[model samples]
Each structure stands twice: as structure tokens, then as C-alpha cells.
Target: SMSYDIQAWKKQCEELLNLIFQCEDSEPFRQPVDLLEYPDYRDIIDTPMDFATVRETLEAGNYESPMELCKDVRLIFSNSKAYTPSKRSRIYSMSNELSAFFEEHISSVLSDYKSALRFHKRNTITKR
Candidate 1:
């Protein structure tokens, strides 16, 4: 008798995404980088994640667990950190700031979902 309510879960995730989008440093992470703009970008990052990508998947209900979406959002920031020319660059710093904001709030969101956020070997992937 695992009690998991995805209705509230999805809504909570959406709100967190909204907050991330509002971040001032979030402009760069808002959309996928075009290979035409930076050909090496494709070679450097295996997977590119962005706010819009996350949103499309969210709207499609592609994530089964909160942690799944969590990682993808993290990917956006981490990728930015990787591509920036220097670690000391403002682009690099922006990701750190934006990443921190999500981590803090996502933690709180998970706390609220704890009651129904059970992890089963098959539950999340079962997508049932």
C-alpha cells in the first residue's frame, strides 16, 4: 500500500521551475546552445539540458520521480559551468548561484513530498 500522489508532486515541481526561470543569471541556461553558434559545445557536453527542455518534459509528464527532474535541472547549470572559458568567469559564477537556488528549494519541495515519495525498485520506472 504505497501512497504516492503525483498530482501535488507535479505542481510542486512546476513552481520550483518557475523560480529557477526567474533567476537573473538564468538567461544562458534558458535554451539549448546551437551547434552553429558554438560547434565545440556539442563535442564538449554529452547531454544538453535547459529550462525550456525541462519545461517541455514537465508538461509532457516525462519525469516519474522528483529526483529525475532534479538531475536534469542540475545538468543545465553544470553544463554551463563546463563550457565557460574560465572558472572565474561570470558565466561560471552564474551557474553556481543558480544551481544553489534550485538545490535549496528542491530540498524543501522533497521534504513536503516525503510522505508519498517512497522509492521502490520498480515504482518510479514502472511509471504506473
Candidate 2:
């Protein structure tokens, strides 16, 4: 059983994403290519999860950054205008889940990063 507040936040984020996906407002989710103007025009937001990041994490055998980035995913989704009213109401709930997920899941990511740092330190011991 993973016990951490961030885990809960991740769950919350997932819930919000589900809500966003279920929204009837298709325009918000659509890219601006077709439309010249969006009344609710706002800057585009990108989630933290990139293919490269996920791939690197997988290659490194660590899950911390991915988990932590989940919050960013939720953030991007939540910020999008496409979310349903229900999802907007639930934003905080998702925020909390991500908060928990990151707290609990960050260790693995950090541990891997630390290992790399340690190796670098050793390799650079005699460097100018």
C-alpha cells in the first residue's frame, strides 16, 4: 500500500482529467488551427510528461519524475477551457491528489538522479 499525500493528488488529477474528457465543449479541446478566434482565447498549456521524459525515466528504471509530472498534466488539462463544469468544481480535488502523489513518489526519481550525481562527483574528483 503506497501511503502518501501526493498519491492522493494524482488520483484527484486523474479524476479531473476524466471529467475534462467527458465535457461536451469540444471547442476547448480542439486546436486553434481551424478557428481564427476563440472567445476564451488563452495561451496553450503543455503537460510535463514528454515522450522523451517518460522514455528516459523508463530507461533509468525510475518513476519519480513521471509521478511528479502528473501534477503538471493535471494542471495543463485543468487550465484548458474544454473541461466540464463538474471538472472545474473538482479542480482542487485533483490538485490535492497530485500534491500527494508527488510527495510519495518523488523518492525513486531523486534516488536515480542522486546516483548519477554521485557518479559524476567520483568521475570529476581529479578534474580541474
Candidate 3:
């Protein structure tokens, strides 16, 4: 198992959020548009994922460790607004890519813990 430097992982999470914001800026789609009207633009923030809430949480420094910060970051992914239509467009493409990147960064930070759990499960099974 491996341990991550808390500060370093937090910095990485910050970078990941920055990238996700960039993707949102790059997206050209918005609401009040029909499938035929603006195929490129789809509602991405159907459900409100308040960034301010997370920012406040972070600024308040209520978290005891990096893992706690990671939990906050995970909420963003969970709250991600769903896109409409199965058709692919530039906005959809970029959003999907950035979403994947966010997941990867979180996984990297939590990988050691995941590995340990997997190992423990295997060991337990073998001993039985």
C-alpha cells in the first residue's frame, strides 16, 4: 500500500476542478433549446451542484485530512448535470473527456486505499 502526500493530493484535486470549470466554459450549449433547435447545446446543469457550497466547505477548513477533501470533490462528480440526446457533439465530447479526467484524478488519490481493500478481500477469501 502507498500513502499520498495530503497537500500534494489536494493541489491535484484543485487542478482537476480547474480543468472541469474550463470545460464548462468551453461548452456552447444551454437550456431553452430543443433537440432540433440547438443540437450542440444540452442542459448540463439540470441539477444544481453548488460550487459555492464546496468552496465554503474547503475555505472553512473543516476537513481533518486529504481524504475528507476528496469526499467533497467526489460530490461534484456525483452532482454532475446529465446531458440530453444520444447524439455526440463538441460540447458533449469535451464534457465527457473532462469528466473522465476528473474521475482519474480522484482514483489516483484513492488508489492505495482501494488496493488495500482489494488485497484484504483476496487474503480473506484465501484463508477461508
Best by TM-score: 1
- The TM-score of predicted model 1 comes to 0.81
- Candidate 1 backbone overlaps, count: 0
Clashes within 3 Å, all models in order: 0, 13, 1
**122 in model 3: Cα distance from truth in Å?**
19
Lowest lDDT block of 10, candidate 1? 119-128
- lDDT accuracy of residue 47 in candidate 1: 92
- Alpha-carbon lDDT of model 1: 0.80
Which regions of candidate 3 deviate over 4 angstroms? 4-8, 22-47, 50-53, 62-83, 87-90, 112-128
lDDT per residue for candidate 2 within 1-128, as digits (tens), equals 22323323334434444454454432233232222453333334333232234334444645453445554444534554243346445543454444454445555544554465556665665645
Query: Can you rank all candidates by lDDT, best first?
Result: 1, 3, 2
Each model's TM-score, in the order given?
A: 0.81, 0.33, 0.45
Candidate 1, residues 1-128: lDDT per residue as tens digits?
A: 44456456688888877887887888877888888888899878999888999989989979886878888988888788779999899978989988878888788566556656554323566545
Task: Estimate the TM-score for candidate 2.
Answer: 0.33
The lowest-lDDT stretch of 10 consecutive residues in candidate 2 is 26-35
